[PDB]
Design an enzyme around this catalytic site. Structure first.
Site: not given
Ligand SMILES: *[C@H](O)[C@H](C[C@@H]1CCNC1=O)NC(=O)[C@H](CC(C)C)NC(=O)OCc1ccccc1
Ligand SMILES: *[C@H](O)[C@H](C[C@@H]1CCNC1=O)NC(=O)[C@H](CC(C)C)NC(=O)OCc1ccccc1
Lengths: 298, 299
Positions: A39, A141, A143
């Site tokens: 992603h 950030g 990931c």
């Molecule tokens: C990648 O850095 C990020 C890790 C999340 C950021 C908040 N805590 C984490 O572990 N991954 C994502 O934002 C992910 C991306 C999708 C394409 C899978 N989406 C996600 O985790 O949705 C839930 C969420 C997003 C933002 C804040 C809290 C939860």
């Protein structure tokens, strides 16, 4: 007893940052390949409903910014394998450790090197839960941060971080890009299944108690594996596999307590409680120390 | 919310093995000096009541064997600073990080890199307790393992490990060789002072629990600082100072829970117990996160 991570130096030397557009995350640089969550190719709006095949069609090698620190690694090839991107770079990492890629089971623990912008930030121990989530500590950030175990200077990478679930727990893939559990890398509402207590690790903790002289809970009973598994499931405990019985082998030999005798002690604990008594100082059973963690620490 | 340690790589590249006679332990190799606990020069019989100045004068450079991985380093000078030995070697450590030696105060946290035979074994977060012990995980051969914090690529070394007390807690020195606490590097059973709990850390961890959605322990009651401190002292908690209240400022603003409102929450917890409930998965009140640890991990 305390949660103890592996030394992280071998993994720190492999962390880089990967950027597409304004989306930045971490990648793992081993030999001349960088592994990262696919992603990274998404805009924030496309994460709601992405078509990864179509999005990657529009990317070329020159659309990927890979940096070790502020030093750019030129990308010379790219491909998608399940939910990870593999970026071939023009430099082989001189700090590459001996390593393997492994897929772990619920119950197994690993160290997480939490990283932001390719910079390692913290290290801690995690357990893979029965619902294939981990109780991590991850911010925006993070990931591409990886989980790992070390065996005689060989690093076994087992986890790469992709997302947070609404309950606050985290989900990710192995290093071949296969998610643990029934999750998908789409920013859509998803739910973790029901969790269970990790039976094999509670047993390891009971052996750890016995090794230190706390053995009041040892009773005169035994059980078969199947009878134990059926009772344990009524207490929201995981059933034991043959691999579980085998990985308790060393602790069973050390204490002289047969695995199934210990199961019979645990079954008594579940059916009768702790009765205002404690085990290793606590009245709660601990389930995030594996048998290896117990031997490694002891 | 987890107990997170700093990444240990910058310290790993400094760990060496130091051997004198039959005794083996770890050293910290910075530039052309190796720092290690001075009881490496003891034999088994010296340890009960060692006269370290006397034992050291009878040693030569060649009595010290220093191994860095598979390479033996040549000791070209040795001195003693308090309970730490400084071995000058003929090789500079090319992996020496930017670093400082610091003496920490009770309540401060640090990461420990546990090592055996000069090889790193595990990393975990500890706190210096009020009675100047730490709750570590250390076995035979772990002496010379160090505790540290990392801030913008600079390693602040604050702890070198020397001993385990009969209660199972641990004691050691700063990198100038001065013990934390009333302990001595002799092979005797030593007791610590009363272990008062670091109140400002318990409050930081309650704020961490609220930031992570745990609120069952909150209440509508309020308390003055002095009335809270009366109850805290009754339960062997350290008194909260106005500086502690200020340090908790950011966590209070983030959660909207005034510091003294959280104090009234803690007072109830101390007087009523937790009644079988849990906070951040813990059945006991956790005291090894500083306010800064909470803000860093949570943001
Ligand atoms: C990648 O850095 C990020 C890790 C999340 C950021 C908040 N805590 C984490 O572990 N991954 C994502 O934002 C992910 C991306 C999708 C394409 C899978 N989406 C996600 O985790 O949705 C839930 C969420 C997003 C933002 C804040 C809290 C939860
Ligand atoms: C150094 O490797 C070692 C670390 C101890 C070993 C067991 N767990 C540890 O953390 N330090 C010592 O063995 C230390 C030696 C100096 C004091 C000379 N001795 C020690 O810790 O024993 C304490 C003790 C002595 C007598 C009775 C009860 C405890």
């Amino acid at each position: 007893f305390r949660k103890m991570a592996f030394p992280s130096g071998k993994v720190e030397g492999c962390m880089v940052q990967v950027t597409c557009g304004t989306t930045t995350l971490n990648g793992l640089w081993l030999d001349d390949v960088v592994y990262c969550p696919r992603h990274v190719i998404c805009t924030s709006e496309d994460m709601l409903n992405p078509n990864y095949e179509d999005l990657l069609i529009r990317k070329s090698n020159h659309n990927f910014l890979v940096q070790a620190g502020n030093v750019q690694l030129r990308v010379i090839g790219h491909s998608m394998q399940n939910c990870v991107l593999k970026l071939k770079v023009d430099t082989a990492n001189p700090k590459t450790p001996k390593y393997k890629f492994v897929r772990i089971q619920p119950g197994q623990t690993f160290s997480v090197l939490a990283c932001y912008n390719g910079s390692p930030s913290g290290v801690y121990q995690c357990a893979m839960r029965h619902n294939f989530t981990i109780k991590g500590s991850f911010l925006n950030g993070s990931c591409g941060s990886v989980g790992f175990n070390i065996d005689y200077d060989c690093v076994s990478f087992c986890y790469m971080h992709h997302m947070e679930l609404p309950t606050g727990v985290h989900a990710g893939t192995d290093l071949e890009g296969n998610f643990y559990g029934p999750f998908v890398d789409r920013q859509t509402a998803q739910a973790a299944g029901t969790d269970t207590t990790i039976t094999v690790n509670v047993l390891a903790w009971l052996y750890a108690a016995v090794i230190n002289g706390d053995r009041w809970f040892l009773n005169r009973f035994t059980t078969t594996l199947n009878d134990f598994n059926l009772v344990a499931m009524k207490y929201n405990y995981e059933p034991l596999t043959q691999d579980h019985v085998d990985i308790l082998g060393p602790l069973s030999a050390q204490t002289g307590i047969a695995v199934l005798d210990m199961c019979a002690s645990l079954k008594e604990l579940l059916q009768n409680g702790m009765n205002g008594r404690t085990i290793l100082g606590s009245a709660l059973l601990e389930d995030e120390f594996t048998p290896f963690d117990v031997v490694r620490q002891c």
